[PDB]
Amino acid sequence: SPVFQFFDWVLRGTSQVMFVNNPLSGILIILGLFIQNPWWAISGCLGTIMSTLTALILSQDKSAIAAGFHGYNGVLVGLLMAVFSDKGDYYWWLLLPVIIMSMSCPILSSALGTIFSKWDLPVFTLPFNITVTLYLAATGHYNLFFPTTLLQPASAMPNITWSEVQVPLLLRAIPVGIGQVYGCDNPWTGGIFLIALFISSPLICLHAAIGSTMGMLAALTIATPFDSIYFGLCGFNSTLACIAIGGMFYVITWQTHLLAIACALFAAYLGAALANMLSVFGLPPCTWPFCLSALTFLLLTTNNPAIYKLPLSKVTYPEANRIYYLSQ
Amino acid sequence: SPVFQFFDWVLRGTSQVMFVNNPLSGILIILGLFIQNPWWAISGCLGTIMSTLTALILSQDKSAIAAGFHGYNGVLVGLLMAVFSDKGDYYWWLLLPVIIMSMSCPILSSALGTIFSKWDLPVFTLPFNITVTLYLAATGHYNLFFPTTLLQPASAMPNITWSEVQVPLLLRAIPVGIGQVYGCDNPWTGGIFLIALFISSPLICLHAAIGSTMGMLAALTIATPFDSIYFGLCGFNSTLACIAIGGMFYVITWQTHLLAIACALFAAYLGAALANMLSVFGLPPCTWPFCLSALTFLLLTTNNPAIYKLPLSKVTYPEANRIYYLSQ
Amino acid sequence: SPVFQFFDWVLRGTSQVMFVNNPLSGILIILGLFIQNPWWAISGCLGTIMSTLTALILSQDKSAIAAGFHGYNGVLVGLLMAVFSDKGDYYWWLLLPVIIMSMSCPILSSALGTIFSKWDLPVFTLPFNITVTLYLAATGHYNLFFPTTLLQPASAMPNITWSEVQVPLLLRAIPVGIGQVYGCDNPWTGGIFLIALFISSPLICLHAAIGSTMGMLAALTIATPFDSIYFGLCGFNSTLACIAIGGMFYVITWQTHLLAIACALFAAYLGAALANMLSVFGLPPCTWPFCLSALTFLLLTTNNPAIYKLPLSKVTYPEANRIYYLSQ
Numbered sequence A, B, C: 001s002p003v004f005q006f007f008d009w010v011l012r013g014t015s016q017v018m019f020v021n022n023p024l025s026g027i028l029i030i031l032g033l034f035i036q037n038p039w040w041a042i043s044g045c046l047g048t049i050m051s052t053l054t055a056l057i058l059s060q061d062k063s064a065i066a067a068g069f070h071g072y073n074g075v076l077v078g079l080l081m082a083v084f085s086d087k088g089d090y091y092w093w094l095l096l097p098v099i100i101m102s103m104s105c106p107i108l109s110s111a112l113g114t115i116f117s118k119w120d121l122p123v124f125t126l127p128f129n130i131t132v133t134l135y136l137a138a139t140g141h142y143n144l145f146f147p148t149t150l151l152q153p154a155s156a157m158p159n160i161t162w163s164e165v166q167v168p169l170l171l172r173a174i175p176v177g178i179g180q181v182y183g184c185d186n187p188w189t190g191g192i193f194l195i196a197l198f199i200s201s202p203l204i205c206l207h208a209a210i211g212s213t214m215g216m217l218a219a220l221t222i223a224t225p226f227d228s229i230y231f232g233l234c235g236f237n238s239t240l241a242c243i244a245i246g247g248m249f250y251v252i253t254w255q256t257h258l259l260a261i262a263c264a265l266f267a268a269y270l271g272a273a274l275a276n277m278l279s280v281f282g283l284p285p286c287t288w289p290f291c292l293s294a295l296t297f298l299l300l301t302t303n304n305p306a307i308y309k310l311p312l313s314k315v316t317y318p319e320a321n322r323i324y325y326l327s328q
């Protein structure tokens, strides 16, 4: 049935946010979002629905829609409309900007796909980043219709007392970090995301956890305030980068594992940098550092035979990628 | 006569600002600029003269100069030197920065032409945007020689009373929007621009009017203050985008008409976004949103046979483009 | 001996900052840095050591390492860690960020090398600019570990009294300008840099001096405060641009000499522009204008046979380049 096929496409799209392609993973992600906030989940699901539908509308590639490569940007768009809204939860007028920007996502996903086709690089979350930055800059904190949360630059020296760091909460920053990929902050939605990643590919889960831990640790090395690390606002740019470089767009080897860790460090430090730069505009560093760091690590040309950049036409999940590479 | 040939080249250049190639259209545009401000028109005409002359100087392509593709950036440069100047009208020292930056325009127009040659995209107004942003950032509001008008970010919630909107002035925002392509604000110079566009291609006029109206309407959907919409500071990024996607760089079809309308919406919202971001630097969103939106709509790859991206070597005006396409 | 080979590679790397490839030039540059500040020189030398070492680590090209194209970014990174540090000289904890960012430089140098390979353009200092901007934005002035010097935008009209300009100091801005390529401010380290450039290629020295003078003069045309020009914060973006366009990446001709002067003007004005824009973030215009101006002048396509863009595989120094061109 066409309706069932479209629903399958929309679940897969949700999943593609943590680099997974599995309807069960998508349904678990939706369950976790319902655990966090029903309003956020409704906005995100509507966003991915509109993104996929307009992907079909503008005669896009059927395989890309069927694999969810046109619905992962929309779900994030809806979620961070619902996160960076000052009007409070269940503000139904916020759905209209979700409509417009979700329809706008595939246009960017195709234009940037044409730009990044020469060098064979994925668009990543760049269509989303552009769309949500456009929204949060066009509106800002001072609308009468769709205001946003006020983000301000640091103007005083932070007070960090290292003798009162909560190590248990610091370790809790790992599951919370895997859940800020969607902007959620509940530890249990993070655990649900871990399970959803594991049911598809265990190596994706391992890289996500190690990247979140590594983004935490990189945040502690520049005296980032403890409140953020606990929420994960430090961890997420690192999870996506680690999953990207570990086994998704390379072949998994120990050299590539170390390169993924290095990309996680670069993503964390670039997260701090872009969070301090984009804050003057009133904008958050919403998955820009992941995009830039993982693009600059995927463009790396090295003579090491172990670091092999897989063609984009043969990327499903790290285990299948590894088997494909040893087969050839 | 070489002098007459150069004058013909300079008139055509002026016209190329609203996507038209006709000396009569150029002379009508110059007449409209004289209606608005003799000082602004003098600065802009000198800017396009220098841009064309330095295009000949740096051994650029003869056809591009003869068709005005090297004088449209300069005229805008001169005009927005004369608009964003705090020293008042008839400040003769402002001509020297016009000299320098107009000479700088073709260099960018060729460099970005080489960058955008692989994907077959026009440079658009990017050489101008870079040049005028460079000027207005290098000087700013606090020089002793060439100060600029102070642009500040929003710091208070605007007071919009929808019961006192001037609908007649709101509809007047359409001709005013077609005149802010040159930075002018007189309704009658807008009407002169409409006539100049119509004498060449009626479809360009239709797309310009519909894009200005659409940029207006998109501005009203984010509670943009009424004073700006009336001036058109909302309308212009949409006119150029609509003319671009309607019949200039595509073949005119109903699908392409709807895509041009969508590009107009994207240009308007990106205009709001970049006007709120670039304001912190003290810079205006001078035709950046048109460039970005129309590039991201011209890079779109779709399977729909009706959306055909014309080769850049066969783009004159939408009617000729349509006849060329049906001929082949 | 491998140790001697690595030391030779590291000296050459230092030199490549002023577009020179000569171990004697490198040792003279290190001597000049020791004249300026032993702490800055230690940080910069450690930075280039780490950059070269990680270039070998990530299986990069042997010829590029042996010619120093992977150590020039690191030395600048270390130097401007030591310049933009608020903790004072001999703050040993600053070495760790130097480690991390110097290791990060070759990754960007390879990624951007792959991007700029299609159009045959050099990466320039872009890997460095990205790395140091990332550092100075991630930390800023308000850390507890690695604070930076506070940079603020202009908020009042500067008071310039042209009747009390120090012409001798103004002329001293030329050697000081050739020394701000490394962030040093001593006139004598500038003279040592002049000698180091001359021992390799006199034409590099001539272009550097003329570019520094031209950046000075371009700074005086926009009422730049006299204190900066004396330090050279105006001169350096122009020296590198002039050396780039004169004889390094083109064949030296009078037309190309004038084009190099024009690139110096563009670099100076873009230096002012980016110094006023990036200041709101708290960031300096650390060799961004040189990169952008010289890229936009190296992408220029002109019909003039005298302006010949040399293939990147045959660029050693302007005299050898000229002899190579006349040979073919």
Ligand SMILES: CC(=O)Nc1ccc(NC(=O)c2ccc(C(C)=O)o2)cc1
Pocket: A016, A017, A018, A019, A069, A072, A121, A122, A123, A124, A125, A312, A313, A315
């Ligand atoms: C020929 C070609 O480009 N194919 C191709 C294009 C794009 C992608 N991208 C992804 O799977 C993807 C994009 C973004 C993300 C995330 C989680 O950020 O994941 C795969 C294959």
Ligand SMILES: CC(=O)Nc1ccc(NC(=O)c2ccc(C(C)=O)o2)cc1
Pocket: A076, A080, A151, A152, A180, A181, A182, A183, A184, A233, A275, A276, A279, A284, A285, A286, A287
């Ligand atoms: C002082 C300051 O900037 N705090 C601050 C730091 C980071 C962010 N960004 C996010 O929370 C965020 C959440 C989710 C995302 C996604 C899904 O891309 O991005 C906001 C505020």
Ligand SMILES: CC(=O)Nc1ccc(NC(=O)c2ccc(C(C)=O)o2)cc1
Pocket: B016, B017, B018, B019, B069, B072, B121, B122, B123, B124, B125, B312, B313, B315
């Ligand atoms: C081979 C090739 O690129 N030819 C080619 C290059 C550039 C253009 N551009 C234009 O006509 C143009 C540029 C900018 C604008 C406006 C009004 O913004 O209009 C056409 C043909």
Ligand SMILES: CC(=O)Nc1ccc(NC(=O)c2ccc(C(C)=O)o2)cc1
Pocket: B076, B080, B151, B152, B180, B181, B182, B183, B184, B233, B275, B276, B279, B284, B285, B286, B287
């Ligand atoms: C608060 C605020 O930013 N107001 C504001 C909004 C928009 C502009 N931009 C322009 O007026 C403009 C005029 C003409 C152009 C062209 C020819 O590109 O660009 C200035 C100030």
Ligand SMILES: CC(=O)Nc1ccc(NC(=O)c2ccc(C(C)=O)o2)cc1
Pocket: C016, C017, C018, C019, C069, C072, C121, C122, C123, C124, C125, C312, C313, C315
């Ligand atoms: C095939 C190819 O790209 N070869 C190639 C690549 C890069 C360079 N770059 C340089 O020498 C260089 C880079 C940066 C600088 C400075 C002082 O900024 O100088 C030469 C040749």
Ligand SMILES: CC(=O)Nc1ccc(NC(=O)c2ccc(C(C)=O)o2)cc1
Pocket: C076, C080, C151, C152, C180, C181, C182, C183, C184, C233, C275, C276, C279, C284, C285, C286, C287
């Ligand atoms: C008000 C203001 O911005 N002053 C200001 C102007 C310019 C700079 N930039 C530099 O000093 C600099 C030094 C060395 C470099 C290199 C090696 O790239 O870049 C800092 C402060």
